Design a protein around this ligand. Structure first.
Ligand SMILES: Cc1cc2nc3c(=O)[nH]c(=O)nc-3n(C[C@H](O)[C@H](O)[C@H](O)COP(=O)(O)O)c2cc1C
Ligand code: SF4
Ligand code: SF4
Ligand code: SF4
Ligand code: SF4
Ligand code: SF4
Ligand code: FES
Ligand code: FES
Lengths: 456, 147, 98, 111, 212, 32, 220, 105
């Protein structure tokens, strides 16, 4: 049939990923940026939306939602009649552990994003774009703004974008250190001037978004690829990838490989095909692999024998009870404490929770305390089942998707490494002289005169 | 041997307060499967109107008429309407002694006997009181033993 | 007037003037051989026009069965005595009255 | 008897649970904030002629503050002597503490 | 206008544009709540009002869900039952065992709805312990036992919107989120004692009626 | 008690403004 | 030991005055015009950073000034500054060392644990305090977005990345020497050859000359 | 005199189980309701009706009982709410002009 992967250099998108050119506008025009943007703007927003519809573009923020459909949600029946401003909010906060794509997009090829704000904007016919950058990416923001100034200076963005009679302007709003501030309703509130606690939807942001105005939040990489798919065609984009997994995409290959880096590659590339061809191989050889976290901290860990013949896309990873997330492929060796790796993530999720809702503000700490115990083995194996259904109590009950973000990693670790955990409990149960009580108290706890309720 | 040691010297640490696995477990018992207090039975009430309808059109276990689709719903109120208007006494008077035989035909042509309260045989029933194999006074005293 | 069933208990709801016929049928019927009064008591419901519910509990040693009979009364509305049928009911009615 | 901690503070924090569960309404409690800000009783009366010696008051305690000692020998002359106020019930606990602690030590696993 | 809808079978007639919890009240259906108050803005933080709605993969928060012309709501389905026990288990994992010393004892919504919608026992036994937070000085009338805070936001909503006294807030993040003025200040509002009644729990009590 | 990078005088600049805030000054929506 | 309530201090008390310098308000004006005129409360985040880069940390007086510029109740500003981590509500060192200890850095290349170990033994301090001479305040942080360049430690506004126990020591020392002569300040980014994120053993892709606008659909 | 009323919901909590039934209770008198016991400080009473209350399903059921027993009765009509549609979406309505409110969740 058809084998996916190894696309040529002449079908790539982010050419300047390795810093071969300075980020100034003059070199950007050599790369095709701002080439036919005037003709693109004159064509109606329907043409832009339908083009991204045919390309099969799905959001690389993590949910993977169809992109043309999402942007078209903002074009309601009587959108013209309302006098309120319309906003394109751009998700430049990349806080997902293992992820580094957008840092490269803004620091290397900024004018691609800058035109993407207009083209995504004109699509959803917004009147202003906001770029919410991670607060740590202070150097990245300065580059991106300098790109914006030249975009205003040359007339590309402003009161008359490329002479098209369109009103669009671009502003950057840096964050201040909150991973919850990547969630789309949390991203709205933070830019509004509040703590970044997410809103609940039935109110959907395409209607009541930023300052209660119609807005769309889209990730950097999704926005940045829009201008090229317009100028090159969505059929050409849809050439790459499987039937519902089209396009190229940026992969962060970090962890236990010989040469960790980030490279863009066609969707549905097999996991095997990717790491030892674009990254020098896993350290110690393929047989010395243990597990791969495919989409970042949120997606469940994937062991050796499942990752043997696994394609890296949205559908195959979802089929494997995992996800592509942002394809922050974290790869771990056979000589590393896997359980310690996941307990450091449930510690990450404890620190990033906003605290607004009960099942996450309490649950992200409860599971973090449990994971440090399972790290030491201070428990009985029945606790493993208790931790499985604590997480099921978290999914779907929270205001935002940061609840699943800390339930999924634990569920994967129980699903594929339960022999590991029970061994550590057995090692603990050997050392102190008996199976610990549920909670981490030693077997002699009642003997030593401590509170021990019947049952733990 | 007797009351030795006292309960005051019985070792506190030896005794164990038990839990049973289903109800006392930490990991496979949602409380709402085992909340039988809130799954209590309601009292099932049948008035004279209800029994007129039950004889008129049957029961969800056994109908008198097919009651297919429409023109059966209006027959279902025909059972309910006749019940309020007339008791079981008017109903039996006017449709004749034929359906006085039918009330007994529900329990096989005899009146039903009431339910017993034992189920030691597996079915609700009277207890079969019989003389025990060996009598404790023998025949020597006016007192028999019953099993 | 009606009958209810809760678990193993069948209750019969009767008109106050039917007291003598109903208890006669439940005393002298061959399928209703309920020859003991176990208890006669009242319950008070001041939210009803007839305040008092009269509860009779009867036992059938023949059929190993129990039946409850309920009727109603008022501050001025009297109930037939059943000491014509059960000698044991005499002191119970004195209690309900008292 | 009303008991203390090893420190010497009264165990009683005036929850009033023993007052709610009393079958015979024999307990009357009035509480407020002590000078140091602690939640403590100002009144603690037990009508020894209303009490049925059920032990419910001591099953409901969350701090083992109220107990029933093994003392059965306290017939008195007047029944005014049978209105125990908080000064007598604390004096009883000070008197009976070794035996109270011993009976609690025996029965705690079953409680 | 009036939409019509079914909740546990029964048709209710509620004005369009109102929340589902308002129609559940009108339909004679008790829905557990902590954050939602009839006279305060809708907040979806507690998660105790999660109900099952036809054509919705997740449980919805009934307090924030607008009523639609034809929806079906099951409030007693097994989806709803395990939802409420899971929230009641989370709301009690870090809650202080302070019911004998709490003034809200005997009139507490956390206690009653734990008895009605929670599990009978608890599964929190961490050797690492529970959360504990320092107390806050917010004037003479209100005594604070903040360990008891369940983060409903009822008082910040009352003080900011009804009293017009925006000195109470919520500083921090995650499990370390705390209610109180960042710098100790005397809540200056002739309506401030309403926060004590609004509190579902005894984290805001009255200093005069301290333990009497 | 150890010294900290706290501004002493009211018109002292403890930390540089940096590149990002420097480029904000050059921003002007009017085309040149 | 970060606290979420205000502790009164001779260096952090409301009575100390703060005002933005006769040079900062120009930056303030440009920031304000980037939002709807009535929604100036959107600017709270930029001015808190401007306030703490002029004073040293987000003091109670700093936060209170930003409140009156934006007509906000100050408690609305306390919730922001307490929510977002980058705001420092307690005085910090000259160099605020931020070592990432999240799983990817814990496995990436050499682990971050040696990098924390190197920092600790060289700086002679534990987690979260400052050095006695008051130049380095060292804390650990969550993923900073340079995972393929693990392990990495950002200091003030720059990312010293791909660190080893030997390299992190000299990066810190020259930074200490930078207080006098700016010539000795270490260059940012990663060490050991990598420019930003490329492959460390030759470029796998992007070798041919880039394609320009020549391959564009003709209808457009 | 007795008061027939529907008990109001506690301000302290949101359960309304006790507001569902009408209560008939006796009014307190100016003397004889409570005095201090000289000996133990207990509260003594002469009011034999102080701890007695009646529950009724409807108002007319309570009135019928009061007149049947010859009580004097004052009926208090329940206070009910005024329905108003509440929408989470309003929390984020757009202000064209001055804000006049900074919503803080
Ligand atoms: C807890 C949480 C964190 C998120 N973090 C990020 C992030 O760091 N970067 C990002 O691009 N999207 C992030 N997202 C996803 C966004 O909410 C949003 O879906 C996406 O940025 C834009 O959608 P699109 O990619 O489909 O266009 C996060 C979502 C959640 C729930
Ligand atoms: S899931 Fe966690 S981060 Fe998301 S709203 Fe709830 S508490 Fe906040
Ligand atoms: S003795 Fe115990 S139950 Fe009684 S008031 Fe004191 S603490 Fe409460
Ligand atoms: S033992 Fe006496 S004082 Fe204690 S609860 Fe029983 S009756 Fe009351
Ligand atoms: S607030 Fe309620 S549940 Fe919490 S301690 Fe007080 S009485 Fe108990
Ligand atoms: S103090 Fe009380 S009212 Fe305020 S958030 Fe906490 S629990 Fe809610
Ligand atoms: S009641 Fe809707 S979430 Fe609290
Ligand atoms: S893990 Fe340290 S930068 Fe992402």
């Amino acid at each position: 049939v058809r084998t996916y992967g190894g696309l040529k250099d002449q079908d790539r998108i982010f050419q300047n990923l390795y810093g071969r050119y300075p980020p100034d506008l003059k070199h950007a025009k050599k790369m095709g940026d701002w080439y036919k943007t005037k003709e693109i703007l004159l064509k109606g927003h329907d043409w832009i939306i339908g083009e991204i519809k045919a390309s099969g573009l799905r959001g690389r923020g993590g949910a993977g939602f169809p992109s043309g459909l999402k942007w078209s949600f903002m074009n309601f029946k009587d959108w013209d009649k309302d006098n309120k401003p319309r906003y394109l909010v751009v998700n430049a906060d990349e806080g997902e552990p293992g992820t580094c794509k957008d840092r490269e997009i803004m620091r290397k090829d900024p004018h691609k994003l800058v035109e993407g704000c207009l083209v995504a904007g004109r699509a959803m016919n917004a009147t202003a774009a906001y770029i919410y950058i991670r607060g740590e990416f202070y150097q990245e923001a300065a580059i991106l703004q300098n790109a914006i100034n030249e975009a205003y200076a040359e007339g590309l963005i402003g009161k008359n974008a490329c002479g098209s009679g369109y009103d669009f302007d671009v502003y950057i709003h840096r964050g201040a250190g909150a991973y919850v501030c990547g969630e789309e309703t949390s991203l709205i509130e933070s830019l509004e001037g509040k703590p970044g606690k997410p809103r609940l939807k039935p109110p959907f942001p395409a209607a009541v978004g930023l300052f209660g105005c119609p807005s769309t939040v889209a990730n950097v990489e999704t926005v940045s690829v829009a201008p090229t798919i317009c100028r090159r065609g969505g059929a050409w984009f849809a050439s790459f990838g499987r039937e519902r997994n089209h396009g190229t995409k940026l992969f962060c290959i970090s962890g236990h490989v010989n040469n960790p880096c980030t490279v863009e590659e066609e969707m549905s590339i097999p996991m095997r095909e990717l790491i030892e061809k674009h990254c020098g191989g896993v350290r110690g050889g393929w047989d010395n692999l243990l597990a791969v976290i495919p989409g970042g901290s949120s997606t469940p860990i994937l062991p050796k024998h499942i990752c043997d013949d696994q394609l890296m896309d949205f559908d195959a990873l979802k089929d494997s009870q995992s996800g592509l997330g942002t394809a922050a492929v974290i790869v771990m060796d056979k000589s590393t404490d896997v359980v310690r790796a996941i307990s450091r993530l449930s510690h990450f999720y404890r620190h990033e929770s906003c605290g607004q809702c009960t099942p996450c503000r309490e649950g992200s700490k409860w599971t973090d305390q449990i994971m440090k115990r399972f790290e030491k083995g201070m428990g009985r194996p029945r606790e493993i089942d208790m931790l499985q259904e604590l997480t099921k109590q978290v999914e779907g009950h929270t205001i935002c998707a940061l609840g699943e973000a800390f339930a999924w990693p634990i569920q994967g670790l129980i699903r594929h490494f339960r022999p590991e955990l029970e061994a550590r409990m057995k090692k603990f149960a050997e050392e102190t002289g008996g199976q610990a009580l549920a909670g981490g108290w030693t077997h002699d706890s009642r003997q030593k005169g401590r509170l021990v309720s019947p049952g733990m | 041997y007797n009351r030795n040691p006292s309960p005051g010297d019985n070792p506190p640490l030896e005794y164990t307060d038990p839990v049973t696995i289903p109800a006392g477990d930490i990991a496979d018992n949602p409380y709402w499967k085992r909340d039988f207090r809130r799954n209590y039975p309601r009292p099932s009430v049948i008035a004279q109107a209800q029994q007129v309808a039950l004889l008129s059109v049957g029961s969800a276990a056994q109908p008198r008429v097919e009651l297919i689709g429409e023109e059966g719903t209006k027959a279902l109120v025909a059972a309910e309407e006749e019940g309020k208007e007339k008791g079981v006494a008017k109903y039996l008077e006017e449709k004749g002694a034929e359906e006085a035989k039918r009330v007994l035909a529900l329990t096989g042509g005899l009146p039903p006997t009431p339910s017993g309260q034992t189920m030691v045989t597996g079915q609700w029933d009277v207890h079969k009181y019989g003389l025990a194999e060996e009598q404790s006074y023998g025949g020597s005293y006016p007192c028999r033993s019953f099993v | 007037q009606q009958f209810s069933v809760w678990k193993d208990e069948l209750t019969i709801y009767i008109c106050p003037t039917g007291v003598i016929p109903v208890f006669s049928f439940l005393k002298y019927n061959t399928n209703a051989e309920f020859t003991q009064v176990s208890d006669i008591t009242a319950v008070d419901f001041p939210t009803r026009e007839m305040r008092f519910e009269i509860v009779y509990n009867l036992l059938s040693v023949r059929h190993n069965a129990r039946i409850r009979v309920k009727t109603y009364a008022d501050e001025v509305t009297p109930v037939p005595s059943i000491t014509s049928l059960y000698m044991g009911a005499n002191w119970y009615e004195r209690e309900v009255y008292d | 008897a009303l008991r203390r901690y090893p420190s010497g503070e009264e165990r009683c924090i005036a929850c009033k649970l023993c007052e709610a569960v009393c079958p015979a309404q024999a307990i009357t409690i009035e509480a407020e904030e002590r000078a140091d800000g602690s939640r403590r009783t100002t009144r603690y009366d037990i009508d020894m002629t209303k009490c049925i010696y059920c032990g419910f008051c001591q099953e409901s305690c969350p701090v083992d503050a109220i107990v029933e000692s093994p003392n059965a020998e306290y017939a008195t002359e007047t029944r005014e002597e049978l209105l125990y106020n908080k000064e007598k019930l604390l004096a009883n606990g000070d008197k009976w503490e070794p035996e109270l602690a011993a009976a609690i030590r025996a029965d705690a696993p079953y409680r | 206008a009036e939409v019509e809808l079914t909740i546990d079978g029964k048709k209710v007639s509620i004005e369009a544009g109102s929340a589902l919890i308002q129609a559940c009240e009108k339909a004679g259906v008790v829905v557990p709540r902590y954050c939602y108050h009839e006279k305060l803005a809708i907040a979806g933080n507690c998660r105790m009002c999660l109900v099952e709605v036809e054509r919705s993969p997740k449980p919805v928060a009934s307090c924030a869900w607008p009523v639609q012309a034809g929806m079906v709501v099951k409030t007693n389905s097994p989806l709803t039952h395990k939802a409420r026990e899971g929230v009641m288990e989370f709301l009690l994992a870090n809650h202080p065992l302070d019911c004998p010393i709490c003034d809200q004892g005997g009139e507490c919504d956390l206690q009653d709805q734990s008895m009605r919608y929670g599990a009978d026992r608890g599964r929190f036994h961490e050797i690492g312990g529970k959360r504990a937070v320092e107390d806050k000085n917010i004037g003479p009338l209100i005594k604070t036992s903040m360990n008891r805070c369940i983060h409903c936001t009822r008082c910040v909503r009352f003080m900011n919107d009804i009293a017009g006294a925006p000195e109470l807030g919520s500083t921090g993040r995650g499990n370390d989120l705390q209610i109180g003025t960042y710098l100790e200040k005397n809540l200056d509002s002739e309506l401030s004692g309403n926060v004590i009644d609004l509190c579902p729990v005894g984290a805001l009590t009255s200093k005069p009626y301290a333990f009497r | 008690r150890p010294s900290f990078a706290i501004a002493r005088s009211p018109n002292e600049q403890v930390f540089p403004a940096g590149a990002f805030y420097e480029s904000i000054l050059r921003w002007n929506p009017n085309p040149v | 030991d970060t606290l979420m309530v205000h502790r009164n201090t001779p260096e952090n008390n409301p009575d100390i005055p703060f005002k933005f310098t006769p040079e900062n308000e120009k930056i303030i004006e440009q920031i304000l015009k980037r939002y709807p005129p009535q929604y100036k409360k959107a600017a709270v985040m930029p001015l808190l950073d401007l306030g703490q880069r002029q004073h040293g940390f987000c003091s109670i007086s700093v936060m209170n000034e930003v409140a009156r510029i934006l007509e906000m109740p100050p408690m609305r500003v306390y919730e922001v500054a307490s929510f977002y981590t980058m705001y420092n509500r307690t005085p910090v060192g000259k160099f605020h060392v931020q070592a990432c200890t999240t799983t990817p850095c814990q496995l990436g290349g050499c682990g971050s644990d040696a990098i924390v170990k190197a920092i600790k033994e060289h700086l002679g301090i534990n987690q979260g305090e400052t050095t006695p001479d008051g130049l380095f305040t060292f804390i650990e942080v969550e993923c900073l977005g340079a995972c393929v360049n693990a392990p990495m430690v950002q200091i003030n506004d720059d990312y010293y990345e791909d660190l080893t126990p030997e390299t992190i020591k000299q990066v810190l020392t020259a930074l200490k020497e930078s207080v006098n002569d700016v010539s000795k300040a270490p260059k940012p980014g990663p060490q050991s050859g990598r420019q930003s994120c490329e492959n460390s053993a030759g470029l796998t892709s992007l070798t041919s000359e880039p394609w320009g606008p020549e391959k564009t659909r003709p209808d457009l | 005199t007795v008061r027939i009323y529907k008990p109001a919901k506690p301000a302290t909590q949101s359960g309304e189980k006790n507001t569902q039934l009408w209560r008939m209770d006796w009014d307190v008198l100016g003397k004889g309701h409570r005095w201090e016991n000289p000996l133990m400080g207990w509260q003594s009473s002469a009011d034999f009706m102080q701890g007695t209350h009646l529950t009724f399903k409807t108002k007319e059921d309570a009135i019928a009982f009061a007149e049947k027993q010859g009580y004097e009765y004052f009926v208090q009509e329940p206070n009910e709410r005024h329905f108003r549609p509440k929408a989470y979406a309003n929390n984020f309505l757009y202000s064209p002009g001055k804000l006049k409110h900074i919503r803080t969740k």
